[PDB]
Symmetry: D2
Subunit: 346 residues, 4 copies
Amino acid sequence: HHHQLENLYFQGVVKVGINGFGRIGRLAFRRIQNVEGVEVTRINDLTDPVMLAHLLKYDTTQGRFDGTVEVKEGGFEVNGKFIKVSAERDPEQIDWATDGVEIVLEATGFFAKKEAAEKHLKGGAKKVVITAPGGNDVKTVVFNTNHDVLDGTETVISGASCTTNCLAPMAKALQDNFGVVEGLMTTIHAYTGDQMILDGPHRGGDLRRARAGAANIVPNSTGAAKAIGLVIPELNGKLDGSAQRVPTPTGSVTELVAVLEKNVTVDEVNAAMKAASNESYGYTEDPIVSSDIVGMSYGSLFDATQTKVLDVDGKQLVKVVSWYDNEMSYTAQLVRTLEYFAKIAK
Amino acid sequence: VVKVGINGFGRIGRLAFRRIQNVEGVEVTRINDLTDPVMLAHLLKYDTTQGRFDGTVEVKEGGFEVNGKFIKVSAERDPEQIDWATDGVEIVLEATGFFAKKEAAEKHLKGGAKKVVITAPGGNDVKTVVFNTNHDVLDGTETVISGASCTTNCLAPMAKALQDNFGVVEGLMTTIHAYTGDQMILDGPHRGGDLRRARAGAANIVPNSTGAAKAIGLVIPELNGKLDGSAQRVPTPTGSVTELVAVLEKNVTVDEVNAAMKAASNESYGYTEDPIVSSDIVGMSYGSLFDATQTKVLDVDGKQLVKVVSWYDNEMSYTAQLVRTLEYFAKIAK
Amino acid sequence: HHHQLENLYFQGVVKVGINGFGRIGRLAFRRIQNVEGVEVTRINDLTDPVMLAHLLKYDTTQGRFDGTVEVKEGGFEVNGKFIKVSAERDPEQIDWATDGVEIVLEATGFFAKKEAAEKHLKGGAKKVVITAPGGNDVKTVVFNTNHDVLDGTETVISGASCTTNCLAPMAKALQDNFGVVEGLMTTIHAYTGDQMILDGPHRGGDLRRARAGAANIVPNSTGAAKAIGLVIPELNGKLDGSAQRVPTPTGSVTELVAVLEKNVTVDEVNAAMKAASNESYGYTEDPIVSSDIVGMSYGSLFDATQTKVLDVDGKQLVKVVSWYDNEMSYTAQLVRTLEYFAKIAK
Amino acid sequence: VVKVGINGFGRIGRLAFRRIQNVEGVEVTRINDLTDPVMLAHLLKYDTTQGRFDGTVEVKEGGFEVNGKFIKVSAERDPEQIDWATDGVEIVLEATGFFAKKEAAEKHLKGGAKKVVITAPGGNDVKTVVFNTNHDVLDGTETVISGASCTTNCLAPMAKALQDNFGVVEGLMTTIHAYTGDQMILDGPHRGGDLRRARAGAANIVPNSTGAAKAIGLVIPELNGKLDGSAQRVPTPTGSVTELVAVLEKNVTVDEVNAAMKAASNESYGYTEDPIVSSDIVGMSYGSLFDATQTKVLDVDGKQLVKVVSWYDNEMSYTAQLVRTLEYFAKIAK
Ligand SMILES: [Ca+2]
Ligand SMILES: [Ca+2]
Ligand SMILES: [Cl-]
Ligand SMILES: [Cl-]
Ligand SMILES: [Cl-]
Ligand SMILES: [Cl-]
């Protein structure tokens, strides 16, 4: 009876707008091409469209675009369909509604806070998903970990980080099955665009991101584990971590060393992960390596071959390890949350 | 003068030769390897990661002339075939990827050598020595000893310091490690059957099993059975870093942890507070370099997990430790 | 009237056998999965099948296998179909005919010469294609450059090398349109399995292949240009060349600097290449880079953006440049020749 | 003592500082760069490709203390803002990726410097000097000069030797070149609009335009307009090799070509017959290293095409040439 959900039953097309056509924005565009009932009808980015079209067609790590891309006067012709490309620097000036846009992926990195991201509503968009944390009045959502926190009335939400989308389902499964006292994370992580190609002054003052990223093992700080409480309240304040950036251009792996609230065996841990598996959190027993997860659609892929339970006179330390393509795994999660959020809008 | 012979002129054998050139009272007078000496001379002169050789190398009838001195190069395959005594060799560096067994390594004594140091674990009936961690275990009467592995030479002083200052309940190690010659350059069948070492080593993050932490008890009895670990091989050709996450027997602060490491520092175990990266340690002579910038103490309602991290050049750091043990071992004679 | 060709008209299935399941053998298997009317019914390789199945499923440069692979008693289950995998070290002992094999891809590198490769005929196979040169009584075939040299009665043929399959259509187009006096080739080439991962003794005695291949620019000798006469008789003895191996795991590019028999312009050269283009020899005017050709199906991809015509008081030197994936481009050519050879057998 | 000031403490500026430490009678007394001195001190100490600094570096109020001596570090952005004379600087190394113009570079003279050397082409009204190829063109009265590019410093002695011995009709260059800081670490918009420098530089073979061969006439008048070329950038962080394919004015043999290069050899132009690879030249002080193992003479019915190949460390080889020109330029004063 009619306080009912509707968009799940009778929505034809979810029209998406992308503000910021960097790595994530372009990869989200690519994924949406394969999502029935969701399509991008507007891109906004200050870069010359000739440059943007070229980078959409050709991608070092993710391969050639599946289809044709041609620059036109007001935007691109992508697999026939024209798609407007604007270059407004003020989000309040983007007339999203003229292109039917209802939800915006905000991926520039300059409008993270609620009031900043809500500028897209002035142009007529209804909802916004941020490609980063994750402020004071904004929920953080890892799809298939805590998207049930959404009621559909929120205006701005965060898709969390890529590392959070890998860690969260793995840490939650430990908590649900065994209980976590505390734990430390180490991500062995592909280099990224916040590192220098060769040694040189880094804008932020980071003496390690100043170093050649493709020729070094580079320690760097993280926030996923310290901030996990935003996705899994029961783990608030229980985890910390850091990263080692290494010379691959994409593909990463997350290790968690944890003290649990009860004793376990390796098989029990692995069986718990298998039972928690879904389209966001995969399970494998194959001895794969990082190139095997590039382009994959899981947000997180648990690797049962790397599980360890160290038992010393009954005192136990546990290691669990999950793979992720820090590019496409995070993008696949963003797109799941984009669609879900739009469809439970009401 | 300690006259040393080298069996196996691979990465470690060649780098040990380079180091011994600078150890007064130690000199190599006999190399032997089943490779054409022209190939060996070229690989001694030119080294992708460790640079060009300091001096002159010329191939001559029976071996090399290195900085004037001639050095016999043989090509046997049984240590008994090596007349170490004809070249005056007293102690042998055994550095082929095989032969890591006492009876197997004792074959060199028939050729007239007195002592043998094997460049890998092989310690069922053989003492395992990380210099400046436990070389005091040697009395000089041993025939064959092990220099342990390079991961052990990195971990051991760090783990020993935690044990000495605070007590260790248990711990898990992760080493982010340069690729090595037991991995394939491109995807292909690995002779051991390892499905991960069969993969392209310079284009992947590759999980790898280790033994350093599980076998630490051979170097630090007080840690026997308390540790486990594993590795992630990554696309650098040398330079590695070892992380240890441990449960200790008392609560600590970060400053207390770092101060304990500094107090344990010496020529084998370095200390830095500079935010370095892996290229900054390639070629260094410390066996282990503790990095105070990476220390973590997670305290959750008084229960603590501690992370400590040391760097090492898995090539030159290990080699420098081997040569320390070679010199000391020869010095304390029998 | 009935001295007619038949296999082009009424052949149902070309059954292929692969001797040697290395990089090329596995990639040829992958391509054949997408070739209607051609299928592999027998693999012979001395490697443990568990290792071989794993390497077919997971491929660092060419991605995950499109489908499922499962080890069975006598071989593999690949996308349902069972495929026998033997491990005979003597090719005369391979009973190809029991599996209906008519043509063998001989890719071990130990049976290049005619008499050696003809051992496969003892087991009942009819034809053999060698994945390397290219002996004294054996024709060398670059598909869509000189496959018309085949009359279908040959027993053993060579698919040439991967570098030859890139150079040949480019050199032939210059010869046909303008005439070649002489020329020198330089390939900038991915590292390969004949190089060491770290500095160490090389079995062949090559002091450069002994060096770490992923951490160096490594000069190495070639044979494609010196031996081009085997594919293009009119260029016999007119070319020489060499290679620089560089730190990418696949993807290569071939430059030819040539003296021609007449003066030209850059546009004239590029137009000549466009007219010579086909499914083996592509044409592009996009400023691509090496990652953009990994996995591609052209044997050779001419890049019009790199064309140069240096004219000094009327004396001209010309540079033309073509891309190739030294893995998949060569494999795609091998598979074209495999099918054609089987189908004009008669 | 020649007192030098450095504007721009990037790769070249820092490596030139490292070299000048070993040039007696030349010393840097003033650096200025718009970067925080803490960042600059860290990058001087630690260098991914060129190793750790030889000495001590400590940040202090007005700059660095390097091996005791204090060195002022400023952060202006207009050469007139630099009081070179207050620091006694006579000659300025102008090494920011901009300012490659005579009037632009002459701004340093207002601050009290006498001469300027720009670390890139900028030669419309500025002489271009490859040391030991054409530094005899300087008379000492010039204010601003160019050290040319690093590709020019590699090509020039090789091309000059062909011209001197045999005569050059024409030629095309290909350099297989390390990636540089004008390429992206990952695919992304390039500020110049270059669709190839927008691509991940350590994961691709990247075609690149050059100017060294087209502009060679500025260093070797006899080759003006005779050459063209281009580059392939590849995944090494330093170390490069330049190939020249040329039509000569007479027929030659390989031995004749190689002998001519050996006779042209000097401190700027080296000669080797060893089959080296790129890591063997990183850090070398020669501007150019001719490799006789790569020489080709293709003779087809008497018509010849010749290939000659030289190595260079696009970082340190170029820097060593710059510092040679700095010293000479200061020495021949006005
Ligand atoms: Ca869609
Ligand atoms: Ca098929
Ligand atoms: Cl964290
Ligand atoms: Cl272990
Ligand atoms: Cl050739
Ligand atoms: Cl040029």
